[PDB]
Write a protein that binds this ligand. Structure first.
Ligand SMILES: Cc1cc2nc3c(=O)[nH]c(=O)nc-3n(C[C@H](O)[C@H](O)[C@H](O)COP(=O)(O)O)c2cc1C
Ligand SMILES: Cc1cc2nc3c(=O)[nH]c(=O)nc-3n(C[C@H](O)[C@H](O)[C@H](O)COP(=O)(O)O)c2cc1C
Ligand SMILES: CC(C)(C)CCc1c(C(=O)O)[nH]c(=O)[nH]c1=O
Ligand SMILES: CC(C)(C)CCc1c(C(=O)O)[nH]c(=O)[nH]c1=O
Lengths: 313, 313
């Protein structure tokens, strides 16, 4: 019975990794994730310059999940590139590097410089398509023209296989359009579904107040709130992008949640809110729990059930 | 203390009502809602002709909420109009009629016929800006030009105060654009936020199957999953539409949940999943719970805290 995966020319002991932004901002974080039982790790989404991000409190968690408006705090590209180039031990597990430039030019400049490190060390790029574009316009992945622009430019400037982190969609027309745009780009080898469910609002009844400071309390939702949304998106893209991989992210607290992602079509499975709350010990528990479900059902490998969700009739 | 209120030239004993589509399809259902302790009721969204809707199972509920792809099953406009004009007892509570024609023309045809009944009897219109998938086009409230068209045409055809049922948005630009569109129409006097969160996917781990039959298991989410989404939309529209009322819908199981909706800006508070699950007795509990929260805080009226959620600095 086996949780191993071989994909994108790397070998992974198991499908679990952190979700970008959780336990991956500092060298200490990245070493912690590397020491954990996860099968891979991804670095905090970065910008060309270091950023302090938004005022605190900017993340809060609750029994049903989390809300955040972190504002892209990060040590800057040079740091994550140096981590990839010189510090990460690839004999432990594969590394993904997430980038989230504030304009297309910023993303192009970073991917040009990551390319030789990707070639030499095998660091994998996750391009964060919830990067904000011009203020007053929707996030890039919700503006299909901008999305196409970003993927054109990045494909040309990078020239190697990469992946994209997608926000959740809620309309079949959007699944259809988004997947078609992604399918225009052969170097997009994986699609990570999903980022946080945008601009929720958590209110504390006792204090009659919002719980995070930025944006009058509005922020991205993770955790139990978003599992069915995440599963839908994983399956919508799995079905629409048959020559790509789908990585699942959202609402994973247990091997059963991970099993559902995989049935929906997930290859790798990312863990955000639950990892933030539980810490990196969660990866042993998830592995154990998933292996137990597999043993009860008689499945020996992940590919025996990946994408095999049954429909009715 | 009593929680009676005055909106849209009607008097309401309390802010609670069913959400459209729940306990409101047949004459029996409407009679049951009238006999409940709810402050108002709304009828199932109707089309010009009767519809059977989608194959069953088409609704499923779980501890954290529900998923549905009912397919607009309804008895047809003639039935709801007849209910409004001859059967409903207006001395018990106000009635809202939801319409959801499949084209602008169908909606116009229905509203022309509702107008004289709204004049004579005081039935209120909730126009549902959600529809079945049509390949190649987004849902109407997600296509801002189509939405402005529906509203121009209905406003002209109806000529009386009405409200609109909105799907959730997830992007601040979208809030700004949608609110701008609604504010073009002075007859749109209330906005109901929100309809179900579109196209989630619930999978049963034991059977490895989706749980509803239509649309390969994809359907709208309600219940606990959507409360922060619902609060965000209530508050975003309450902020952006100062000359309209906002009605909250989404994730209400307790007086505390309703309290949060009212804090975010809700005038009326609609109950969908929790009503479907618990039955019409839920309304006495919700009132009791909301009055208890008010009494412990020293609030004597809804007006004292409606829209008064606090932000941090
Ligand atoms: C504190 C925090 C920071 C995040 N930062 C990033 C980020 O830098 N880049 C990114 O793609 N997603 C980011 N996300 C989104 C997570 O990667 C993830 O998509 C989302 O939380 C959903 O998964 P979950 O339900 O496991 O939390 C962040 C989430 C949290 C809670
Ligand atoms: C079984 C079912 C039928 C529904 N039918 C309609 C409808 O006909 N018109 C409509 O505007 N919303 C309809 N909805 C959406 C609800 O009115 C409501 O917006 C949604 O369920 C969110 O509220 P909740 O969290 O209380 O369930 C329906 C929901 C359910 C669960
Ligand atoms: C949302 C952005 C600030 C534009 C990018 C980073 C990010 C953050 C964040 O740093 O605020 N939070 C998330 O939930 N998802 C993200 O992708
Ligand atoms: C979704 C439609 C079928 C387009 C309209 C009726 C409706 C339904 C429905 O009848 O399936 N379900 C909901 O969650 N919201 C709705 O507004």
């Amino acid at each position: 019975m086996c949780l191993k995966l071989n994909l994108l020319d790397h070998v992974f002991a198991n499908p679990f990794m952190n979700a970008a932004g959780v336990l991956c901002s500092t060298e200490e974080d990245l070493r912690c994730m590397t020491a954990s039982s996860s099968g891979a790790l991804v670095s905090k989404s970065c910008t060309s310059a270091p950023r302090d991000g938004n005022p605190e409190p900017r993340y809060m968690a609750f029994p049903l999940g989390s809300i955040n408006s972190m504002g892209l705090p990060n040590l800057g590209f040079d740091f994550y590139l140096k981590y990839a180039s010189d510090l990460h031990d690839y004999s432990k597990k594969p590394l993904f590097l997430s980038i989230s430039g504030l304009s297309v030019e910023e993303n192009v400049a970073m991917v040009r410089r990551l390319a030789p490190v990707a070639q030499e060390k095998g660091v994998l790029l996750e391009l964060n398509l919830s990067c904000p574009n011009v203020p007053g316009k929707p996030q890039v992945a919700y503006d299909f023209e901008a999305m196409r622009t970003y993927l054109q430019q990045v494909s040309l400037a990078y020239g190697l296989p990469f992946g994209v982190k997608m926000p959740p969609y809620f309309d079949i027309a959007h699944f259809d359009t988004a997947a078609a745009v992604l399918n225009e780009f052969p170097l997009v080898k994986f699609v990570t579904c999903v980022n946080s469910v945008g601009n929720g609002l958590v209110i504390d009844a006792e204090s009659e107040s919002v719980v995070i400071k930025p944006k009058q309390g509005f922020g991205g939702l993770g955790g139990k709130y978003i599992l069915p949304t995440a599963l839908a998106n994983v399956n919508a893209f799995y079905r629409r992008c048959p020559d790509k991989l789908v990585f699942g992210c959202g609402g994973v607290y247990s091997g059963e949640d991970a099993f559902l992602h995989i049935l929906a079509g997930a290859s790798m499975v990312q863990v955000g809110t639950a990892l933030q709350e539980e810490g990196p010990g969660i990866f042993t528990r998830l592995e154990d729990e998933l292996l137990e479900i597999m043993a009860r059902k008689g499945y020996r490998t992940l590919e025996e059930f990946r994408g095999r969700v049954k429909t009715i009739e």
